[PDB]
TrEMBL record:
Protein name: Regulatory protein YycH-like domain-containing protein
Keyword Signal: yes
Lineage: Bacteria, Bacillati, Bacillota, Clostridia, Lachnospirales
Native source organism of the sequence: Agathobacter rectalis (strain ATCC 33656 / DSM 3377 / JCM 17463 / KCTC 5835 / VPI 0990) (Eubacterium rectale)
Domain of life the protein comes from: Bacteria
Keywords assigned by UniProt, alphabetized: Signal
Length: 347
């Protein structure tokens, strides 16, 4: 049976990474279920490099900054003639802004982030029910549907997102995630009485190197050494075109430090199930994703060590404080060194 736990483990022990399944489903026991995506992205084998990377500073070189600004302005169709530029320096970081005060379109570029948005895009992605953070509930998951909006197909929308990442010169995995922000995306914080829900597609693309995306884990400064964030390039579009473009921190590969064979995900899942069985008293669990990612660890002088990890994303149905039986589905995760299987402490 395709849904037996031992058969699922065996299916995750493929000698060729490209032959692993993309989804697995099985019951472990009456308090632990697996209904999970398997993500090995564009990895070509289990032999993976570790290395050193340098942070890409988007704003330190004014020429490079303005070059990024023009690509973002093309994407959101910003009227550059009527825009007002502003600039600030904060703790050695340069911040550049371009605002169209008539339309409320804006571009903001800092050392490790860039955001271009229309007024409608801003409200769809950041003033409504949709949220981009995995923690604490993975609210985005309810918008990951096959609905086709009426202004363009999901296939045509994906072609525009792929073309935009190429224009921005950001290498991303072939797999992206699509969120459909239709009427279910309730507008919570309108700015004016004229603001309404606007049908929008939101793609998450994943900047990568050697076919493996940088970590999609929540911030965990104890583990990474810095205020890390989820690696997703967010591209949204409505009937007017691209409406929101958020670029996460990017990195430039400097050198390979070591290369080795990583564990098959069977080894990770069996170890993670053994761990999760011990946390049974804290609530029922459902494993939702096993993913091969590159984690960054702060080193020195804007350099980071880049090493492969296996991330297990799961939900736990936890009792709400002060409640006798009311529970909340919490989005949690575990991280393993992909070479050794060392489990990292996630507090
Ligand atoms: Na609608």
């Amino acid at each position: 049976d395709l849904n037996d736990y031992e058969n699922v483990l065996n299916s995750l022990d493929e000698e060729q990474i490209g032959k692993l399944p993309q989804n697995i489903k099985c019951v472990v026991n009456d308090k632990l279920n697996i209904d999970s995506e398997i993500n090995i992205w564009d990895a070509t084998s289990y032999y993976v490099k570790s290395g050193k990377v340098k942070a890409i500073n988007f704003s330190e070189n004014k020429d490079k900054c303005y070059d990024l600004m023009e690509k973002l302005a093309k994407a959101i169709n910003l009227n550059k003639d009527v825009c007002v530029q502003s600039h600030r320096s904060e703790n050695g970081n340069e911040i550049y802004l371009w605002d169209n005060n008539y339309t409320q379109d804006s571009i903001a570029i800092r050392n490790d982030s860039a955001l271009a948005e229309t007024h409608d895009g801003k409200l769809a992605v950041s003033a409504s029910k949709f949220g981009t953070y995995y923690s604490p509930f993975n609210d985005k998951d309810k918008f990951r549907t096959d609905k086709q909006l009426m202004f363009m197909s999901a296939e045509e929308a994906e072609e525009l997102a792929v073309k935009t990442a190429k224009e921005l010169e950001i290498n991303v995995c072939e797999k992206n995630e699509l969120y459909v922000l239709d009427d279910k995306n309730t507008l919570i914080f309108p700015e004016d009485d004229t603001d309404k829900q606007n049908d929008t597609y939101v793609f998450f693309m994943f900047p990568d190197v050697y076919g493996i995306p940088y970590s999609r884990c929540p911030e965990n400064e104890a583990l990474t050494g810095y205020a890390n964030q989820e690696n997703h390039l967010v591209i949204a579009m409505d009937e007017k075109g691209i409406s929101f473009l958020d670029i996460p921190p990017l990195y430039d590969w400097v050198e390979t430090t070591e290369t080795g064979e990583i564990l098959h995900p069977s080894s990770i899942l069996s170890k993670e199930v053994d761990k999760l069985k011990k946390y049974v008293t804290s609530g029922d669990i459902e494993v939702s994703e096993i993913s091969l990612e590159y984690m960054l660890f702060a080193d020195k002088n804007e350099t980071y060590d880049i090493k492969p990890v296996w991330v297990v994303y799961y939900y736990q149905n936890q009792l709400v404080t002060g409640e006798n039986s009311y529970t909340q589905k919490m989005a949690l995760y575990d991280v393993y060194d992909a070479y050794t299987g060392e489990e990292y402490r996630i507090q």
